[PDB]
Every structure is written in C-alpha cells, then in structure tokens.
Amino acid sequence: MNPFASLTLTTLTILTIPIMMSNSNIYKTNLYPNYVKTTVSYAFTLSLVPLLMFMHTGQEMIISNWHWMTLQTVELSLSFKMDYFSVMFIPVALFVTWSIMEFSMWYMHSDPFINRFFKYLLLFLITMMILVTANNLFQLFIGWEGVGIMSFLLIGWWHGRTDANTAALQAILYNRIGDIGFVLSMAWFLTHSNAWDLQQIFMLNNECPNMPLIGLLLAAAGKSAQFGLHPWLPSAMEGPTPVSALLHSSTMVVAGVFLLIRFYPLMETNKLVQTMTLCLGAITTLFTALCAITQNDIKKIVAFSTSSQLGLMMVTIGINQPHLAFLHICMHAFFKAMLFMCSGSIIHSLNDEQDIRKMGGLYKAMPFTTTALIIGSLALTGMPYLTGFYSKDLIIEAVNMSYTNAWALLMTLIATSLTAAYSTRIIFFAFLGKPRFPPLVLINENNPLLINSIKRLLIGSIFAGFIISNNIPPMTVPNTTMPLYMKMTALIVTIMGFMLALELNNTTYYLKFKYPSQTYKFSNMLGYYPSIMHRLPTYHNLSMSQKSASSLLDLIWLETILPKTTSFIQMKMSIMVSNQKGLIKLYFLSFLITIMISMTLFNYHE
Amino acid sequence: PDSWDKDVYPEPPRRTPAPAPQTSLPNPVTYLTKIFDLLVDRPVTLAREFIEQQHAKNRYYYYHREFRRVPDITECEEKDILCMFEAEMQWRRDYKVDQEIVNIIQERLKACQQREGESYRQNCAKELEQFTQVSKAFQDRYSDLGAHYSARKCLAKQKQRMLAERKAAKEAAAA
Amino acid sequence: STFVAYLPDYRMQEWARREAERLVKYREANGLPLMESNCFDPNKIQLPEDED
Amino acid sequence: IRWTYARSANIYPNFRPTPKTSLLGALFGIGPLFFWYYVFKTDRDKKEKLIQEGKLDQTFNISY
Amino acid sequence: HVTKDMFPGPYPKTPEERAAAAKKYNMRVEDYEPYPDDGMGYGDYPKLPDRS
Amino acid sequence: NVLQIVRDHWVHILVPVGFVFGCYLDRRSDEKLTAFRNKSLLFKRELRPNEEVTWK
Amino acid sequence: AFSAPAAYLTHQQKVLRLYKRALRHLESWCVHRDKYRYFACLMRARFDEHKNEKDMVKATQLLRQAEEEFWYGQHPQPYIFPESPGGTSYERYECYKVPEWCLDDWHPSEKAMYPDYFAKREQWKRLRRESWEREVKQLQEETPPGGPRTEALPPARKEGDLPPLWWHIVTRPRERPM
Amino acid sequence: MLKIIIPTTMLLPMTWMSKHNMIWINATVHSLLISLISLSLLNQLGENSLNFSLTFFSDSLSAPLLVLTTWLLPLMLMASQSHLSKETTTRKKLYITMLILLQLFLIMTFTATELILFYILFEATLVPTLIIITRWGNQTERLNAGLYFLFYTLAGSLPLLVALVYIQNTTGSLNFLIIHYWSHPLSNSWSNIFMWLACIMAFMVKMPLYGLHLWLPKAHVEAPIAGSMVLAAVLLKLGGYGMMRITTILNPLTNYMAYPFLMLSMWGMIMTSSICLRQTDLKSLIAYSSVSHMALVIVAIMIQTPWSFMGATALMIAHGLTSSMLFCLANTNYERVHSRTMILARGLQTLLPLMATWWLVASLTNLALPPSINLIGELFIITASFSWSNITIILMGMNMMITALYSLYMLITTQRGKYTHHINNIKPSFTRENALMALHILPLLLLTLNPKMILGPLY
Ligand SMILES: CCCCCCCCCCCCCCCCCC(=O)OC[C@H](COP(=O)([O-])OCC(O)COP(=O)([O-])OC[C@@H](COC(=O)CCCCCCCCCCCCCCCCC)OC(=O)CCCCCCCCCCCCCCCCC)OC(=O)CCCCCCCCCCCCCCCCC
C-alpha cells in the first residue's frame, strides 16, 4: 500500500520503544546507552527509504490517523505532514543524534546517571520529530513545548550547581516570551480561518495580515534566539557538551527558522513582516559574530557562532528564499555538531578545561581532532565545494541580487567576515603555539567511539553538500548573471577576515602591554546586554511584586477596606450600645423621649 | 474503498504516469518496494484474511436511527412547555447536523489543497467557493447566539434579519 | 477507564455525520444550495404589518 | 522565624494611613483598573461601530 | 521555643528600645538601624545593606 | 466459628445494600413519571403484538 | 576555606592579596608564558620598589592608588580555575554528595550487602558517642567567660581525647563522591 | 440518582460501627466503590440533560464535578490517616463523619434541579469545612481563618437568597429547566442592576474574585491537609458552576455589567501571579496559584461564549486535580520537617528522587504543558478572549510567562541545590504518599486521552 506512509510512521514509532523499556531490566544494566544508540541508528537507516522515494518521484503525503476530539465546526486530529522538509530533516537529525549518542558513550562514561541521560536525549529527539512532522498548530505547539522542557531538564543536568539552574530558568523565560506570540498566532488563526490545520490556513489566507505573521516572527525569534531574546543560548552551555552539540547547536535551535519555513506561503505575500525578519536576522548575525571574536571559553565561541548562523538563516528567509534556508539548516547541522564534538574532545583530554588561554599546541598532540576541527572550520567559512558552500555561497549571492535593505546587506557581509575571524581565533589559540596546560599530560584521543563518531560527521561535512544539492529538484530560480566582483564577494570578505584576524593574533607575541579600549570591552561583555537586562527588569519586577502586590495591596489596603473597617465599626457600635451604667433613671428618661417622639413622628401622621 | 460514498467525498480520476527508465543502472526504489511488499504486505494480508474469515462467521447489523419531524418553534404557543421542548430538541439536532455539513465541506477543502500541490490556488476554486457559501449560511444562522443559545433566540435573529432586509428592499424600491 | 472508553454514542456524533452525508448527497444532486441562511420557513413567520 | 514573621504577620500592626501610603495604594490599586477599562472599552466600541456599518471582514468567522 | 519577646515589634523610639531591638536581632547597637518610620509596616525589623 | 467473622465484618454489607436500595428507589421514582409514555410526537409508536408498555 | 578568619586584614595581607590578583589578571592579559614572565618580573620590581616606606600613611595611599589602577585595568574575563567559585565546574559534583546519616535508614536487605562496612560504621558511631561529652567539657573549660572571640577550636590534649567538634569535618562526603 | 446518595449515607453508620482499627480501610474501600459507581454518570446526551426525578438531574457540566468529588474522598482519607494517628477513636470517626457529610452535601448540590435547594446545600457545605478547619488545624491562626471563611461567604450569599425568593415570586418557579425555557431579557434599570449584583456576588466571592479573595490564603493555609484538598479541588468550583447556571437569566445586562469583574480578573490574575514570586510560605504560593487560575475561569464565564464555557469546565477539573496534588506534595515535606518555610529544606531531589519526579510532574501540569487538559482549558479561554478583544492576549501572555516562572521557582527552590546540613530526619517516602501522588496524577493524563468528558454541555 505504497510503503511511504508506513515507513515514515515506523521511523517515528520505533524511537519510543526504549522509552517504554525504561522500567525494565535493561535500564538498570550498563547496556542501555548502546541499546538506545542502536535504536537511533536503525531509525536512521529506516528513514533513508522514504527520502529515496521522494528523490525519485517527489512523493509527498499527509496522514491524519487519529481523530482526537471535535469542536462544533473545528476538527482536531493527529496529523503528520510528510513533505520535502520532513523527509529531508528527519534523516539528518537521526544521523547527527546517532553520532552524538556514540560520542556521549565515551564523554559521559563516569556519570552515575548515564542511563537517565540517554533516556533524556532520546526524549528530546522524539519531541523534535513531533515538532517537525506536525500538520496542525496544536501538534506543533506540543512539540515546541516538549523540546523546551527537555532543554530545561538537560541544561540543569548538574542540579546541585546554582548557575545551571539559573541558565535553565533563563531559557524557559525567553521561550515563554516567544510562546506568547505562538499563542497569539494560534488564536488569530482559529478565530479568522476557523482551523489549526495547515491546508485550510493556506487556502483561506491569500493575503495574510500583519498580526498572525508578527506572532509567528516573535515565536521564531524566541526559539532561535534573535537579538531581542538572544542571551539564553550562550548561557545554555552550562549543560554537558553532548547537550550543547545536539540541542543548542544543530537541531533544537533551528525550530524558529523551521516554523517560518513552514508558513512561507503566507510570508510570501507580506512585505512588512519580510522586512522585519530580514532586519532582525541581520542585526542578530552581526551582533553575535561581533561578540564571538573576543570570547575565551571555546563553548561560548561555538554558541555565538550558532547564533550568528541562525541570524543568517533569518536573513535568508527575509529575502523570500525559504528553501535555501532549509538547505542551510541541513548543511549546518553536520559541521556545527562536529565542531562542538571536537571542542568536547579537547575539554575532556585537558581535565575539563574550557578556557582557550590554557590550551597549547594540539596540532601534533591531537592529530585527528585537529584534522576534524580544521575541516569543520573550513566548511563553516564556506570554502568552495564543501558542505557549507552549497548553502552559504548561494545565500550571500542571493542577498546581493535582491531589492533589499542596504544596511542589512552591509551587516551580513561584515558578519560573514567576522565568522572567519572567530574560527581563526579558535585554531590559532587552541592548536598552534606552545603548551599552556598543566604539566601532567593526560592527552589521549585513542578511543574507537570518539573516532567513529567524528569520522562519520566528517564524511558528512565533506560530501553532504554536493550530494544533497544534486539530489533535490529545483525549487528556486538561479542567479546566472552576476558581475565578476560580486560573484566573489563572499570569498573576498572571508579572505580579508582571515588575514586581519591572523595579523591581530600574531601581534599578541610582542612584548607590548596596553590597556584595552572601550570597543574591546563592549565586544567581550556582550554589549552589556546581560549586565543591564538581567538586573534592572528583574529587580523592578520582584521589588514591585513584593512591595506593591503583596504588601501594599493584599496585606494592607484590601484588608483595610473590607474586613478591618467592618470589625472596627461593629466593635465601636458594640461599645456604644452595651456600656450603660444600669441606672433606671437614665433609660426611663430615654423611655419618655421615645414615647413623645413616637406620638408625633408616627402617631400624628395617620 | 466502498466504506464511504464517493459523491459526498469526491476525488479526481487519479492519472499517474508510467515508469520510463533512461539509465542502465537499477532502480533501488523498485528493489526496496519489492522487498517491502514480500516482507510486510503479504503477512499483513494473510492476517487480515484470517480476521475477516472469523468475522464472516458472526454477522450482525446496527441501524441508523430515524427521527420524525415535529412542529417547529414557530408553531408553538408562548407558554406551551411540551411543544417548546420538542421544538428545542429538534432545533438542537439540526444544529448538530449543520455543524457536520460544514465539517464535510472543510474536509473537502483540505483534501483539495493537499492533492493539488503547487497548483492549489487555481485548482481548488470550486471547493473554496462551496466553503464560502456554506460558511456564510452557517454564520447567518448561528453566529452571535452565544452561550445559552436556544431556538427562540435563533428565531429572533432571523426575524431581525428579515425586517432589515424588507426595509432595505422597500427603500431601494423607492429609488 | 475501559468503561469510559467503550461508552455507547449517546452524543449522536456518528448519527449526525450520517445524517449530514445524506443531506449533502441529496442537496448536491438536485442543485439546491448546501445550506440555507434561514433555519425557519418564512411562510410560518408573520412580520409586523407596519415598519414606518 | 523572625524574617518570615516580619514579612507576613508583623506588617499590618505596623501600618499607618499616611499621605504616602494612601497615594501609593490608590495609584497602584486603582489606576491600572481604569487604564485597562478605558483601553478595552475603546477597542470594543470601535469594533462594534465597525460591525454596525457592515465592514469588518467577518468572513469565515464561524467560532467565537 | 521562641518566646514572644523574640519576635519583631513596632518601630523603636527611645534608645533603650533600640538597644533591646539590636540585642534581639544579634547586632551591635551602632550597627542596628530600622527602616524609616512611615506606614509601610516594616516596624522593628533592621535595614541591612542591599548587597546580594 | 463464623460468629466472630460476621460480628467483625458485617459492616461490609451496608454500602452495597444502600446501592441496591437506591437503585430500587430510582426505579420507583421513574414509575411515577409515565404520564407521557408512548405519547410524544417524536416517539409515538404502535404497540407490538405482545408488549404492554414501551419502557418501564 | 579551612582556617578561621580574623577580625580584620593587615596592611601586608592586603598588599599580598593585591599582588596575587594583579599577577593573575596580568597572566590573563598576557596569554603566552615568556611575555607573562617578562611582565611579571616588571610587576614584581614595581611592587618591591616602594617596599621600604616607613610612613604608613603614604604606604596606604600608594595601596589605594594601586587598587584604583587595578580596577581600571583588570581583565573583564579573567581566567578562573574550573573548580573555583566562578569556574565551569565549581559546584558540579554537589548533587552527588549524600550525608552519612542517610545510611541509618537503609532497609535491612540493603544492609545485608556490605556487612563489614556497616561494622566499621558502628565502631565509628560508638567512638563518637563515647567522645562527645569529653569534647563538650573541654570546650567548656577552654572558653573565656565572655564567650568565644574567634572561630578557632582547640585540639585534643588528654590521653585519648579527640579534637572537639570533629564528626562533621572528618565524615565529609567526598570531593568526587559518586 | 439515589444509587449514589444512599451509599454515602451508609458510609456514615459503617464508619460509626467499625472496629477501632479498621475505620480507614473500610472508609477507603467503600469510598472507592462509590466513585466507581459514580463513573456511570459520564454517559451524557447531546441535546438535553438526564432528568432522574423532580428533584435531581445530571448535566454534562455537573457529572465530571460529581466524579471529581467522589474520587477526592478516598484521597483525603489516605492523606489524613498519617497525622491523625495519635487521635482517639471517637474523634477519628468524627473527622471521617465530617468528610462524609461534606461529600454528601457536595453530591446533592451539583444535581439539585431548583435554585433554592441548590442554595441550601451550597450553604450547608460551610459547617463541615468550618468545623474541620477550626478543630483540626495546627496553629492559632485557624480560628481567624475560620471566621474569614465564614463571613466572606455569608455576606455574599444572603443577598442571593433575597434575590432568589424575589425571582420565584415574580416568575413562579425556580426550577432550572423552566427557568431556561421561559427566559426573558433583563431591562436596563437600577432594580435590574442590583438584582444582577445580588445574583452574581456570592459566586464571585466563592471563586474568589480578586479583591474578595483574602479569606482564601488564610483558610487554605490554616486547614489540615484534607481540608485544603477539598477547599481547592471542589469548593472553589461551586462558584463557577453556580455562575454558569445563573447567567441564563441575566442577559442582556451582562453585556456591560461584566466590565469591572473582567478588569479585576485580568489585572488581579497578573497581581496574584506576581505575588507567587515572593512567597516564603510554600502553601500560600499554591493558594495564590489557585486564585490566578480561578480569575481565568471568571473571565471565561463572563464573556459568555461556547468556547469560553468549554475552557472553563476543563480548567476547573484540571485545576482541582493539580492543586490537590500540590497541597499533598507540600504536606509531605511539612510532616517531615514541621515547617512551611520554603527555603528550610532544600536539595530534596538528592534525598527523595521519586518524590522529586512527582514534584516535577505536578509543576509541569501547573504551568499547562501541552497536551494536558490544563492547557486545553487555558487555550480555549485565551482564544475566546481574543475573539472578545485582541488586546487581551497581552495580559494573557504576561500571565503565561509569570506562571511558568513561579512554578519552576517552587520546583528549583524545593528540589535542587544542596540539602540543608542540620536536617537529618528526612525518612524515605512511604508507599502511602507515592500511591497518593500516583492517584492524583494518572487520571489527569487519562483524561487528556479523552478530553470530551470534561468539556461541558457546550461540546
Ligand atoms: C574593499 C571593499 C570593502 C571595504 C570594507 C571596509 C574597508 C576597510 C577595511 C578595514 C575594516 C576593519 C579592519 C579592522 C577594524 C578594527 C580592527 C581592530 O581590532 O581594532 C582594534 C581596536 C581595539 O583593539 P584592542 O582593544 O587594543 O585589542 C584587544 C587586545 O589586542 C586583546 O586581543 P584579543 O585576543 O582579545 O583579540 C581581540 C579581537 C577583538 O577585537 C576588538 O575588540 C575590536 C573589534 C573590532 C572589529 C569589528 C569589525 C566589525 C565592526 C562592525 C560595526 C557594526 C556597527 C557598530 C556601531 C556602533 C555604534 C555605537 O581581535 C580580533 O579577534 C580581530 C577583530 C576582527 C578582525 C577582522 C575584522 C573583519 C571585519 C571588518 C573588515 C571587513 C572586511 C570586509 C568589508 C566588506 C564591506 C562591504 O578596535 C578599534 O578601535 C576599531 C574597531 C572599529 C570601531 C569603530 C566604531 C566607532 C568608534 C567611535 C564612535 C564615535 C561615536 C560618535 C558619537 C556618537 C553619539 C551617539
């Protein structure tokens, strides 16, 4: 019965079996992580078949298998969309997850709760598939919040450490700010189009107004950490390195860009939202590439690189090229994950040290790690014929040949120079020169799990661009006519960034010491955004929620007006009424007054 | 299959092209499809055949329930409680049926949008027109009644709409 | 939970679906409009005589 | 114990109605209510006036 | 086992009240300073430096 | 020996007995509201050759 | 972290702390070892230039000036050891630390495994129960009438005494518990 | 529906005739059986209600509430038998008698066909609750809490009695079916405005509406655990049920009399959520959570749409389950350390892992993680409010962010960090506590599997 649907559903279904096995006698043994890794590899090789079917005949499907509940005119059903985006993203995500789980089998070997860690990673993967294949907005929101909660749990893995809990709560806060816009889009779409499912929404909105698209943009900015809501992603490096390689670099953080790619038919007919997306992406990529070039923690550098690449993805969406943005997501996953994996290898070898200022000459001490990191850096910088090139080169040359904001174009070019500059910094500082680490040398990368995982991701980072570019149907109109200088703009700016960073890193060898400028202080302290925005709003919010909401209103004035006033009045009148001396003279005089008043007041009027 | 009426849920005649191989290389999709067929579709078919064989030995029927038509809310006296109760029940049943009609039309629209692919804006004009018509009718009949709706409030809404239309028509006649 | 899962359809969801299918079939074939704006026949309604 | 008691039970006994207390209470307990009331009333009056004139584009608005 | 004389009280006026309050809060008398005596309800409790 | 068992666990029949008594009283209450049995315009029906009442 | 603090720091203590801070931040600025050695020797010469000032007022004025210069010229992102209070592994293993009293509530089946460990535990508990009163009385004797003035504790002095208040220092969980 | 009422009245002498050491067992078993029997009420119709007799009827709005009441009784029994171990046999039987009487009054309240009978039962629910709070509470504030609980309620409820008897003298009936069929619009006059206020304020104070909620933190903190469970899970929903019933006769006056209550609900929702961020007592935080969720329910009832009514029903059921679970979770720690201060006992995940899992699930349902019925109700209400006015999303949006913040603040403060060194009496979790948490949480997800059973009559 056209095995496409059955295979696409089995790929997602077999991922949940190790979750159902979490209360069996496999979860208490030391075979559980290998079991989960084998399950993920099997899921990947199974998902490879629907991809081949699509690449052969372009087949696409939607499956509404279960009818969950029905409203008066709205029907909600468990529905899966199996178009190009899903059937292309699922194998890439499964491949990356397989490599990262095999890496974690070595990186987290000394963790007493590795079984739980593997279960957690698997849970995140399931929620991401739910997000990616969802056909209606409620299912997509389920996946959205699932991956958010999974990232919260994985960031605070070391729950005895205060900073990890702070980073997890910060991630939740920013993603809730985005969730506001997600809910706004949901409410607008239901009250105006009468549906949450994707097919109906496209049909009823030929010219989509501003509000739903602005809500979608806010949600995407929250999930992909754009300039307004950026800081949580770098602070998410508090979790273990495998979490940073899988969730916060390649798969979970592209969710906002994927959400905008899903709703591209509506974004195609609104110029203002497109312009806002383009400008947001441009400022995000420039700001994060500028922050990355002066960071000393290697994980921070890779996190800022990921944020800048997300900004570039947003820019690509802003110029009405969603398929290029999707291709860039698929291309970036490989080398970003492998770069984080090499960083984790270096960190583990040097006794959990992350500062690049204490990393010496690892070019010779770490040959395979050096080779992998060099290949990943060259691919990230869009070196010709590599995986990065088949997306980033086209993105740059499509930004150049469009009617677009000029400032956005300038910031995109400066950011793509700063990318090469930051990549150069890691290589020069981490691999060249003389050792700076403690003298008890424990460097050892001879472990088959690490070698195999990084080798798989390296083959990906070398050949995936060519293979996937040649195996997809043309969904764009190519730019076949460019001035020669503009065709080489990306290469020229990359080379200039390379040379400038090399000069500025070579001058550190001189015996000259000068105090830093204000530009360096701005770049290193992330423009003072976390220093101000994490102190002023939080202080005012908490202080007002104590002084005014709790004390001034609830404990004082709301008490004062209704119950305290009643008690005071009743007590005063009780004292007035009950305090008589018991002398018959006084209240018999009172009786006389009452009798006289009564005859005239009520008796005279009959 | 024959499970549903193909007039209520229509589909185009399903034209699919024949395979035209142009390479000496084998097609991996065909080989994988043959493997999937022989390894999955046949045991499932045998299990279904066994289950249907067991089902045929125990056959029983359930019948769609029929309801007669009773007087509407218009043919009821002001305080007649029993006639009002029957009319309200009938009106509620008709409201449910209208909701299901709108549901059928929306299902048609969604299926058309998925089926037509990149040509959906032009190839699904008729379903969009039908949905617009049914949505307009349904909206006039039940929108703004709010919670605690009843047949009397629907009748009041219809009377107000008729009064407005009659006044508009008479004023346009004087033009 | 099993008892609640297998409760008989007293909400008449499937009955309403089948009734709507019959109605749509009948109205589509005859060329009649799928739905009517007025749910009550105007012949049984008596508007007030004067609107002035 | 002293901290929790001061934050909860010792507050009202040490409260005096002062110009500062009265002004802050009136402001922070009254101003938001009428601010939001004005906003919502204006929005709904505008929407109702648009509906009366028959120009709101309520097409496909089946569910409320 | 915390007696009622070990609980926060009203704003202290005489120096003897300030000494008793400082003894209650385990502070030196010259270190103890209450909040300003408005109607805020702070009362007896000491105003410590605003460092986190 | 069942004397002590009964005197220790006879409180276990009060609730089931209350349940069956409530069922009986509900049937009795339903018995007093048959003024429109087989008389509604929607469900009025000719009797079968054997049955006496359409519902109890 | 192990020594009881004093009521205040002295001038030489402050100078030594500033010297260590300045050297660390200079190493943060000077990544390479030879450059760091050069500028650290320069810093040491600068520090010991004014080592022989008999006027304490001018010494404190110089210390104030040096602290102001350090604050202006400090590294915004100085190097921190991974397990130091600002490092990447500061409190990483605190969630694995379990107090020893939790073992008192293990089910007897759990205690059936590890019999010798629990025998040693019983010996330790008996030791503590026997030494408590002697510890309390030694603290009572050695304490001045107006209460203790520092947080330093006396050691054991008698035949088989133990240093008072030792149980929770000796039975720390571990630095890498699990 | 005497097949449910009579077995509870039989629970009474079964408790008073049981042996001194079998009262808990007998009460729990027969309460669970009564809940199983009440499960049959979920078979509802699509057009009208189940009209059992002249006195009792079951709708699609009251059946889940009855099921929730009958299911809550055994959980309260399990939660109470720990701290009542030293009590005498007679006083334990009296406590169980109070709980049984409360269940009987609640069961009769949700099925009364007349408004005066509904009033009498909804007011009779006061005596057992007040007795429980003021007799079996722990601290001296329980007396003041009982006074606050009593008078806040009665000052709202007495004008309702006057309005009800007036309405019966005017229209000739208080039967709900007759009231619905013979409904007539309310004019715009001062008499009608005050009739509206008299018919609405009692249910408003029961929710409770912001500014009229001061009784709730006192009563819900000073009560014993079973008192808190039944106060948060069922007794707050009396206001919502009564308001959805009574609003049938209030149109079209509600169209503008709802404005002050709507503004109060939204802004006080923001305020109570903010109050939850700075709370030193763990139980008061849960109480203010209840206030925020009930403010949402008030908004939904006031805007008077089918989607808002569906959301209100779902949210009431979900909140009952979640808040009862949270109160039980806090009571476990209180029984361990005899203090309610939140920052006293920390790092409890190290000492009690399974209880930490229960904490995580409860706080995840509190913040309305999809596809829980908490989120179904919240999202339906938010959509209805957006249709009412597009600017509500801002206030609604702020509330969602704040709720997540304080829920995870509670979780991180209680479970993460490092365990306090001086506390060494934290014994392992008993089977009873784990079973209590499981019986709270499993029905929530089971109801998520089939959400039309809690969506009300407007479904
Ligand atoms: C041919 C056609 C195309 C033409 C393109 C343009 C042609 C010109 C070519 C030259 C381009 C730039 C070349 C280098 C630029 C500067 C390099 C540099 O590092 O300088 C050192 C110096 C600081 O050095 P330091 O702190 O001593 O060094 C640290 C130690 O060595 C400690 O060392 P460390 O280990 O910590 O390392 C520090 C680290 C980090 O170093 C820093 O801390 C400073 C970083 C500066 C580089 C920033 C570049 C991107 C700038 C984006 C600006 C966006 C707008 C900002 C708006 C701000 C508004 C307030 O250094 C690096 O890693 C390398 C830095 C980047 C090298 C590669 C640069 C490539 C991008 C630029 C070239 C683009 C080429 C292609 C262009 C294509 C165009 C189509 O920074 C500067 O002074 C220059 C930065 C430029 C800032 C100007 C902003 C204006 C300031 C005045 C404001 C006036 C206000 C008016 C009134 C306002 C009232 C409201």
Ligand SMILES: CCCCCCCCCCCCCCCCC[C@@H](O)O[C@H](CO[C@H](O)CCCCCCCCCCCCCCC)COP(=O)(O)OCC[N+](C)(C)C
């Ligand atoms: C500890 C280890 C945990 C992990 C290991 C677990 C291993 C796997 C087990 C988990 C199961 C996965 C769930 C997946 C869903 C499958 C079940 C589903 O298909 O059944 C639903 C049915 O679910 C039930 O309907 C919902 C259960 C009812 C919940 C009521 C709770 C019981 C009362 C308890 C007290 C009440 C308190 C609350 C008061 C309101 C389908 O509904 P429906 O579409 O129709 O069925 C169509 C066909 N029918 C109609 C012929 C039957």
Ligand SMILES: CCCCCCCCCCCCCCCCC[C@@H](O)O[C@H](CO[C@H](O)CCCCCCCCCCCCCCC)COP(=O)(O)OCC[N+](C)(C)C
């Ligand atoms: C702390 C929390 C407590 C709970 C909150 C309870 C909320 C109660 C608020 C009542 C809502 C509205 C009540 C009356 C409806 C309109 C109010 C009035 O201001 O509107 C105008 C009324 O005009 C003037 O305002 C006259 C009223 C002025 C005197 C009222 C005293 C208000 C002062 C505030 C006292 C605080 C009251 C609450 C005590 C706690 C409308 O003009 P008009 O068309 O002519 O009157 C309509 C009625 N008609 C049609 C019969 C004529």
